[PDB]
Design a binder for this molecule. Sequence first.
Ligand SMILES: [Cd+2]
Ligand SMILES: [Cd+2]
Ligand SMILES: [Cd+2]
Ligand SMILES: [Cd+2]
Length: 36
Amino acid sequence: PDVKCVCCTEGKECACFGQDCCVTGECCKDGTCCGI
Ligand SMILES: [Cd+2]
Ligand SMILES: [Cd+2]
Ligand SMILES: [Cd+2]
Ligand SMILES: [Cd+2]
C-alpha cells in the first residue's frame, strides 16, 4: 500500500513483481507494464 506501480499497487498480474522498478514505477512511466 505504498508504490507507484499501480500494477502491484492494484493487485494485477505483474511480470516484474517484487522489484524496484515497481517502486520507481519506471515500468509504469514509458508506455505500459508487463510484456514478457
Ligand atoms: Cd509491478
Ligand atoms: Cd505488470
Ligand atoms: Cd516493475
Ligand atoms: Cd509497472
